[PDB]
Design a binder for this molecule. Structure first.
Ligand SMILES: N[C@@H](CCNC(=O)c1ccc(-c2cccc(C(F)(F)F)c2)cc1)Cc1cc(F)c(F)cc1F
Ligand SMILES: N[C@@H](CCNC(=O)c1ccc(-c2cccc(C(F)(F)F)c2)cc1)Cc1cc(F)c(F)cc1F
Lengths: 728, 728
C-alpha cells in the first residue's frame, strides 16, 4: 500500500468508525435513528419500520440537539439550545410533543435555561430543575408544582450536583431519582455557602472589551467542602396549592460526627431506597436502607440493615463504592466489593445479614453488574485468558453459583476481546458492543437462546478503506517486575523490523485505577505517529493501575507522585532492553493526570528521556479538588499527610529539567486543572533558568476540545516530536 | 581581540556603565553617595567632605530603600519597606531623623503603607498620602492634621493619581504641589466611581492555594473615565481642632461642557498657580492662572488671562501640553508650543496677552526648558548638525533673543552628542550628562564662566575592558523617502564587511513621538547579537516619530496601525537595497507598542520578513487605555473613528501569519497591556490554523523585569532568533 495514516487523516477524520446507538423502550422494542428517521426495530420478529419520519420537524423552527421519548410511548421531549457547562452539566431549552395527537404543546412550557429534565421511569411525569429548584409536572400542560424554594446560584443546588459532585462522585449534573413507580422524587441538596471560589479569566469574542471573570465553587485539597442533605417527596399527593413536604432522610450517626459525602442512591422497591455515605477520609463507607412508613409519612433506616464498606490498604471503591442490584422483592442485593485477597468480585447480601457471600472468586475482577433476572445475573469481567486488558459478558445461574457461562469469549476470539452490553427491559434481549482488537462489531442477541440473531454493524466499510492504508499493528503483552506481571501495549509501525532501532514515544496516564493497555481498537494520534513517522508509541500499567486487584491499585495509596512515576521510567528501560528502541530517542507525553506524571518523570533526572509534552498537568496536589485528591492523599496537614503532599510537586523538580526538552500546554479556562497549576511550573522553571516551550489556549478547558484548537494542539505537538526526534 | 560581548555579558552585567547621581540642596552644594557615605561636594571651592558617615545606620534595623533630606538641612526622611505598585507608584514605610540633634524620632510617626510623602520645598513640613487621604505635618513630631476625609480605595484618590493618570498624564503617583513658600498644598481628587475594572489572576508563591484576582480601575478606549476636582489648602493657618477648608478651583467653562482631564499644575508665585486642562478629545487645551484673594480666601482665575492651546493637524503636546516657566515676578512665562510651521519651539507669553512671541525658530525642536535666570533661559535641543538624534544644552539671552550660545556642542564632538543637564538652585552651577555616542561622560560647570571645572565620571574603567572586546559599531544615517529625511540606526557587527551579506534584525518601537535612532551609547541585547552572532540590528524612525515636527509626528493621527507599520516594512526594503543584507533572513521584533507594530508587519504579508517576536503587544486599540488610545484615535464610535479602530487589529491579519514564524510573549500580570491583548491574537491564529510559538510569564508585568524572567526571556528570544537564522 502506497498511502499512510496521516496527521490530516486523524484531524479531519478521514476514516470513520461506525457505531450502532440503540435505545430500548420495551422488553423487545428499541430505537435506531437514520438520516433523521427514528425507526423502531422489533427484535422479536424483525417487522420493524417507521416510528417518526425524518421530516416531522423540518418546520420545528430550531436545530434539535437531543430527544427523550416518555417510557409510556406517549410523548417526545425536544432538547434544543444546548450550552455546555462542565463535563456533564449544561443548560438547554425544551418543547414537548404529543405523539398520540400529532401536535406540539404551547401551554405551560418548560422554561429556557433548564438545568436538568427527566421522565418518570414509567408513565409521563416530568421532573425538571431550573434556577436550582426542582419542579414537577404530572401532565405535559398542567402547571408545575414547585418542590424546592431554596435554590440560590452557586450556593444552593436542589436536584443537581455542584462542580465537585458532578465531576468526582456522580458523573452527572443530576441529583434526582425516581422510584421505579413514579411516586417518589428523591433528590439531594448541596450547600456551597463556605466553599471557596476558583477565579479565572474568560476572554470571549474579540468584541468583548473587558474580560469576564468566572467564579466557581471549587474545594481544593483540605478546603471547606460542600455539605449535603437528602430528601424524598411524593409526586401523586401534590396539591396545586400547598408547598410540598419533602421528607429529609438524615445520614447515619457514624457519618454526622464529621465531614462526609453522599456517594450513591439506588432504589430497591416502590417504597425502599438505598444510600451509601462516605467519610471525608474515604476508607470508610456505610449503606442505609430506608422504608416508607405508610401510616407515618416518615422514612425509617433500620440500624440493623446497614452495611459497612471499608479498606485498611486503601480507599473504598474504584473511584466510589459500587452500586447495589436488588432482586424483585427487594430483600437482598448483589454488589461488587473487594474480597479478602483484594479482588473486586460480586458479593451477595441479605438486607439484614452483616456478611455477604462471594458468588465469584479468583485472580481477576468483575467490571460491572449489568442485569439481574429471576434466573441469572449478568456481568462483565476481565477473566478470559488471564487478560485484564479484556472485557467479556458472563452469566451466572442464581439457583447455582458454579454455572458460569461466558456469552462472548468465543464469538470472534481474533476480532473481539473487549465487549460491553446493552440489555432490553426484563433483560429479554441484548446488544454486544465489541471494541477491539479488530474493528468495532455491533451484534444483537436473545437471552433465552443465546443465539446471535442479527449483525447490526460490522464496519466492513471502514475495513475496505483500511486495506489500502499501511496500518500500525498492536502488541499487548506483560513483563514481570517482582513476582508481579505488568501489562503494556505497543503500537508498532507498519512492517515492523525487530532488528532496527525505532524511536519510542511513551504515552502516559498512570492515574489511580488507570488502564492504558487494553485490547481496544483506536484511531488516534498514536496511529498517525506509528504509521507515518515510524514511532513506536508505548503505554504501561504500573502500580496504582486498576482491574488487577487492590495490591497493585492501592500500592500508590498516600504516595501519589511516586511508584506510578517510577514504574513509568522503569518501563522505558525495559523497552530499550528489547532490541528495537533507539535509546537516544525516548520521549514521554500525557494529559491531565498523565501530564503530571510526564512532568515528574522529566524532573526525575533519570536521563532516560530526551523530550516530553505535558498537557493540562497537575503540578501540586494542593491545587486539585478535595474529593479526588484526598481520596489518595488524605489531608494536607502535618498531623495527616502534608509531607508526601509537599514532596510530590513538579516545581520542586525544576532544576532537573535542565536535562530535557519540555513542552507545556494549558487551556486558559480550564475549570478543572486550573491554569494555575501550569503557571506555577512555568514560574519554577523560570526561577531556575531552565528553557522550555509553552503554549496556552485561550478560553479552552481541560479538553482543549474545540475543533480549531484540537487541530492546533495536535499539530503543534507533532512538530515538537518530529523536531525532537529529527524527522524530515 | 579574542573575546566577544556575549549573552551572559548582557544578562549578568559583565560591563557596568558608571553614572554620577547628584542632588543639589543649595545654589552651590550638592550630594554624592559613596560606599553608603553621603558626602556634600562644594562646587565653589572643592573643600567637600562628610555629611553623613556610612555607618550612621548600621544599627537602624531595616534595609534602607531611599532617603530625603529636608531643604532646610535639618532632617532626613528614611524610606524603607518598598513595595511596587504600577510604573511609578508604590507603598512604603518611613522614619524621620533629626540631623541637628543626632536622634531618630519616635513619636507621632509616619504610618506604614504610605502612598506618598514629600518635604515642603523650603522649610521642613511634610505632606503625606495614606489611605487616599492627605495629611500635613508642620513639625516631625507634632500630630498630623487630616486635610481630606473622602479617600476610598480604588474610588477616591486624594493627592495621588489613579492608574490612568499615573501612566498617561503625570508620570507620578503624586498629585501634590507645594507653593514655593510652603503655604499652600495644591492637590487633585480623582473619582473612579464608574470606571470599569480590569480583572486578572495573580498566582503568587507556590503556597497560595487559590490564585488571587487583581482588580484595577482602568478605562479602555471610550469607557467611562475618572473625573477630577482640584483644591488648594493653607498649611500655616491650620487649627489642630477644625477640619481644614480646601478651596476648590473649578475648571473653565469650555471644559465643563464635557469630558476633560487635568493635564498640568505649575505654580507661578507664592499666590499664583497655573493649571492646564485638556478635553477628552485632546486637540483642545486651556490654561488657567489663578490668584489668591487675600481678603476673600477664594481663588480667582481671570478669564482674560487664559491661554488656549490647540491643534488642527493633531493632538496638543508631545504626549501632553508642556509645562510653563515663570519669571521671578510671575507676570510672564515661557513654554514650548508648536509653531506655525509645526516645530516645537519656545514661545514667550505675558499673563494677559493672547499672542506669545517665538524666541526660537527653525527646522528642529526644543526638547525642554531647563532653567530660567534674570539673564538667561537654558534649553535642550536637537538643532546641532541638523540631527534630531542629538541632544544639546543651549543658552539664550533674555535681554536679546539672537544671543544663542551652545554650551555643549563643542566640548567633545566625537564622544558627546547626547547631553542632558542638572542645574543648581538659582542656576549657579550645572552638571552635563553626556550619553553617547561615546561612553557616558559626567562633568561639572559654572554658569557665570561656562568653564569646565571638574570631570566627575569618565567611565575610562569601562573603556579599559572594552578594548579587550570586539565591540559593534553604530552607523546613524538618513534615507530620503519623499522630500522627507527619515533617520535610521544600525548596530554593525565587529569588522563589518560591506560586500558580505549579513542577516538583519529590525528592532521596532514606532509609536507616536517615538525615537529609536539616536546618538546614545547602549549595552543591550542588540550588542550581543551584532558582536557575537553577526547580526545587523536596525531601527528606523518613520512617520508618527517625534522631534522632527508635527508633519512627521501627526502623520499618524487617527490612523494608528498604518503609515508607521508601512514605513517599517519600507525601511527593511531599503536596507536590502544596500548590499550587506541577506534578504532571505530579515527578522522583526518589538515590545509594547513595538510588539504591535511587529505583529502588524508580520500580518502584512509583505513576505519581506521571515520571523518575528512580539513582546507584550497591543492587538486591538479598544483594549488599551482611553487617555493614550484616544489621543491618537479619538472615540471608538461610528460617528467618530470606530472604523480605523476596527480596521487596525492584529487579529484581522491572522491569515497572513501562515507566511511567517512567530513568537508571542506576554507577562500574565500585565496591568498595562493586559494579557487579554495577546490572548486574543493567539485565539485568532488558532482559528485560522496558523502555527506559532508562545511563551507566557507567570506574575509578570509589562516590564518582564524580574531578574530571573528578564534573563529567561532574552535567552528564549536569542534561541528563537538563532534558530530562525540558522546559527550554530
Ligand atoms: N476528575 C477525575 C475524575 C475521576 N472519576 C472518574 O473517572 C469516575 C468514573 C466513574 C464513576 C462512577 C460513576 C457512577 C457509578 C460508579 C460506580 F459504579 F459506583 F463505580 C462510578 C466515578 C468517578 C479525573 C481527573 C484526574 C486528574 F488527576 C486530573 F488531573 C484531572 C481529572 F479529570
Ligand atoms: N503609556 C505610554 C506612555 C509613554 N510616555 C508618555 O505618555 C509620557 C507622558 C507624559 C510625559 C510627561 C510628563 C510630565 C510632563 C510632561 C511635559 F509637560 F510635557 F513636559 C510630559 C512624558 C511621557 C507607553 C505605552 C504605549 C503603548 F502603546 C503601550 F501598548 C504600552 C505603553 F506603556
Amino acid at each position: 500500500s502506497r498511502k499512510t495514516y496521516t496527521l490530516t487523516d486523524y484531524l479531519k477524520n478521514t476514516y470513520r468508525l461506525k457505531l450502532y446507538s440503540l435505545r430500548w423502550i420495551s422488553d423487545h422494542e428499541y430505537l435506531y435513528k437514520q438520516e433523521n428517521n427514528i425507526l423502531v426495530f422489533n427484535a422479536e420478529y424483525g417487522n420493524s419500520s417507521v416510528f417518526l419520519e425524518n421530516s416531522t420537524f423540518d418546520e420545528f423552527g430550531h436545530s434539535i440537539n437531543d430527544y427523550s421519548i416518555s417510557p409510556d410511548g406517549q410523548f417526545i421531549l425536544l432538547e434544543y439550545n444546548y450550552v455546555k457547562q462542565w463535563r456533564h452539566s449544561y443548560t438547554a431549552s425544551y418543547d414537548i410533543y404529543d405523539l398520540n395527537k400529532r401536535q406540539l404543546i404551547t401551554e405551560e412550557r418548560i422554561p429556557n435555561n433548564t438545568q436538568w429534565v427527566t421522565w418518570s421511569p414509567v408513565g409521563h411525569k416530568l421532573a425538571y430543575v431550573w434556577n436550582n429548584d426542582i419542579y414537577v409536572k404530572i401532565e405535559p400542560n398542567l402547571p408545575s408544582y414547585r418542590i424546592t424554594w431554596t435554590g440560590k446560584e452557586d450556593i444552593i443546588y436542589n436536584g443537581i450536583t455542584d462542580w465537585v459532585y458532578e465531576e468526582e462522585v456522580f458523573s452527572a449534573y443530576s441529583a434526582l431519582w425516581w422510584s421505579p413507580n413514579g411516586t417518589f422524587l428523591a433528590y439531594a441538596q448541596f450547600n456551597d455557602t463556605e466553599v471557596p471560589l476558583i477565579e479565572y479569566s474568560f476572554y470571549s469574542d474579540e468584541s468583548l472589551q473587558y474580560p469576564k471573570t468566572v467564579r466557581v465553587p471549587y474545594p481544593k485539597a483540605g478546603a471547606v467542602n460542600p455539605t449535603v442533605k437528602f430528601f424524598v417527596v411524593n409526586t401523586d399527593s401534590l396539591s396545586s396549592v400547598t408547598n410540598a413536604t419533602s421528607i429529609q432522610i438524615t445520614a447515619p450517626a457514624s457519618m454526622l460526627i464529621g465531614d462526609h459525602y453522599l456517594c450513591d442512591v439506588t432504589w430497591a422497591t416502590q417504597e425502599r431506597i438505598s444510600l451509601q455515605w462516605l467519610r471525608r477520609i474515604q476508607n470508610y463507607s456505610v449503606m442505609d436502607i430506608c422504608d416508607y412508613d405508610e401510616s407515618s409519612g416518615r422514612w425509617n433506616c433500620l440500624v440493623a440493615r446497614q452495611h459497612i464498606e471499608m479498606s485498611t490498604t486503601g480507599w473504598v471503591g474504584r473511584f466510589r463504592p459500587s452500586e447495589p442490584h436488588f432482586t424483585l422483592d427487594g430483600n437482598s442485593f448483589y454488589k461488587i466489593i473487594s474480597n479478602e485477597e483484594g479482588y473486586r468480585h460480586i458479593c451477595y447480601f441479605q438486607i439484614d445479614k452483616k456478611d455477604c457471600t462471594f458468588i465469584t472468586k479468583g485472580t481477576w475482577e468483575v467490571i460491572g453488574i449489568e442485569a439481574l433476572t429471576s434466573d441469572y445475573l449478568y456481568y462483565i469481567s476481565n477473566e478470559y485468558k488471564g487478560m485484564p486488558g479484556g472485557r467479556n459478558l458472563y452469566k451466572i445461574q442464581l439457583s447455582d453459583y458454579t454455572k458460569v457461562t461466558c456469552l462472548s469469549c468465543e464469538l470472534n476470539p481474533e476480532r473481539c476481546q473487549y465487549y460491553s452490553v446493552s440489555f432490553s427491559k426484563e433483560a429479554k434481549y441484548y446488544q454486544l458492543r465489541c471494541s477491539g482488537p479488530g474493528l468495532p462489531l455491533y451484534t444483537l442477541h436473545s437471552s433465552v437462546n443465546d443465539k446471535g440473531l442479527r449483525v447490526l454493524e460490522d464496519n466492513s466499510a471502514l475495513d475496505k478503506m483500511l486495506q489500502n492504508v499501511q496500518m500500525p499493528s498492536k502488541k499487548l503483552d506483560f513483563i514481570i517486575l517482582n513476582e508481579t506481571k505488568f501489562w503494556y501495549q505497543m503500537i508498532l509501525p507498519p512492517h515492523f523490523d525487530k532488528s532496527k532501532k525505532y524511536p519510542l514515544l511513551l504515552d502516559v496516564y498512570a492515574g489511580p485505577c488507570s488502564q492504558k493497555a487494553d485490547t481496544v481498537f483506536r484511531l488516534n494520534w498514536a496511529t498517525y505517529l506509528a504509521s507515518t513517522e515510524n514511532i513506536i508509541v508505548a503505554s504501561f500499567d504500573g502500580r496504582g493501575s486498576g482491574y488487577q486487584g487492590d495490591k497493585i491499585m492501592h500500592a500508590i495509596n498516600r504516595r501519589l507522585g511516586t511508584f506510578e512515576v517510577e514504574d513509568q521510567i522503569e518501563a522505558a528501560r525495559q523497552f530499550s532492553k528489547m532490541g528495537f528502541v533507539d535509546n537516544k530517542r525516548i520521549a514521554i507525553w500525557g494529559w491531565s493526570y498523565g501530564g503530571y506524571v510526564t512532568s515528574m518523570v522529566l524532573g526525575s533526572g533519570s536521563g532516560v528521556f530526551k523530550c516530553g509534552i505535558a498537557v493540562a498537568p497537575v503540578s501540586r496536589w494542593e491545587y486539585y479538588d478535595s474529593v479526588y485528591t484526598e481520596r489518595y492523599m488524605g489531608l494536607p496537614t502535618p498531623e495527616d499527610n502534608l509531607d508526601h503532599y509537599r514532596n510530590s510537586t513538579v516545581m520542586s523538580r525544576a532544576e532537573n529539567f535542565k536535562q530535557v526538552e519540555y513542552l507545556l500546554i494549558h487551556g486558559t479556562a480550564d475549570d478543572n486543572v486550573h491554569f494555575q497549576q501550569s503557571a506555577q511550573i512555568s514560574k519554577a522553571l523560570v526561577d531556575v533558568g531552565v528553557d522550555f516551550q509553552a503554549m496556552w489556549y485561550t478560553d479552552e478547558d481541560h479538553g482543549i476540545a474545540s475543533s480549531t484548537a484540537h487541530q492546533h494542539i495536535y499539530t503543534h505537538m507533532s512538530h515538537f516530536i518530529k523536531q525532537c526526534f529529527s524527522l524530515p
